[PDB]
Ligand binder design. Structure first.
Ligand SMILES: CCCc1cc(C(=O)NCc2ccc(F)cc2)[nH]n1
Length: 148
C-alpha cells in the first residue's frame, strides 16, 4: 500500500492525545493520518491530513526527527506534536469523513486488544481504538525517553 502520514498531538500535561473517529470502514477511533500524494514530502502530507481531518495546522510544530510502524505491508508515520492546549477548537474540513474529534487519556487507552479466553475462542474482541493501539506502547516509551 501507499505510505500514510499524520500526527500524535498531545496536550500541555502530556496525559492526553487527540483522536478522530471516521465513518463506515474507518468507524473507530484513530490518530489523524492519510495517504501520501505522488511527489509529496512526508512532513507536508502529515500537516495536510491533520489539517483536513482536525482543522488544526501543525506545520509550525513538526519536528522532523515521530513514530513509524509497518503494519501489514503499509508504513504509517505519525509526527509527535506535544503541548497543544486542550481548549483548541478542532473542526474537520471534510465532515463527510470525520464523525468526531476528542482527547483521550493515554493511560486509559489500551495498548493491546483483549483476547476471548473466558469464551475459549481464538482472536481478539473488537475495540473501538484498534487503529490507535499499535502506537500507544511506542508513544509511552518515546515520552519516557524524551521527558521523564
Ligand atoms: C480494521 C478496521 C478499519 C478501521 C480504520 C479506522 C480508522 O482509521 N479510523 C480513524 C480515522 C478515520 C478517518 C480518518 F480520516 C482518519 C482516521 N477505523 N477502523
Amino acid at each position: 500500500g501507499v505510505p500514510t502520514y499524520g500526527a500524535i498531538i498531545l496536550d500541555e500535561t502530556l496525559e492526553n492525545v487527540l483522536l478522530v473517529q471516521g465513518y463506515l470502514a474507518k468507524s473507530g477511533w484513530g490518530f489523524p493520518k492519510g495517504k501520501v500524494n505522488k511527489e509529496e514530502a512526508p512532513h507536508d502530507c502529515a500537516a495536510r491530513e491533520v489539517f483536513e481531518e482536525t482543522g488544526f495546522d501543525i506545520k509550525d510544530y513538526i519536528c522532523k526527527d515521530y513514530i513509524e510502524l509497518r503494519i501489514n505491508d503499509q508504513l504509517a508515520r505519525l509526527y509527535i506534536i506535544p503541548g497543544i492546549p486542550k481548549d483548541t477548537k478542532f473542526n474537520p474540513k471534510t465532515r463527510r469523513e470525520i464523525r468526531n474529534i476528542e482527547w483521550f487519556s493515554i493511560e486509559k487507552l489500551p495498548c493491546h486488544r483483549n483476547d476471548m479466553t473466558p469464551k475459549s475462542k481464538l482472536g481478539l474482541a473488537p475495540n473501538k481504538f484498534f487503529m490507535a493501539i499499535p502506537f500507544i506502547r511506542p508513544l509511552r516509551d518515546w515520552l519516557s525517553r524524551r521527558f521523564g
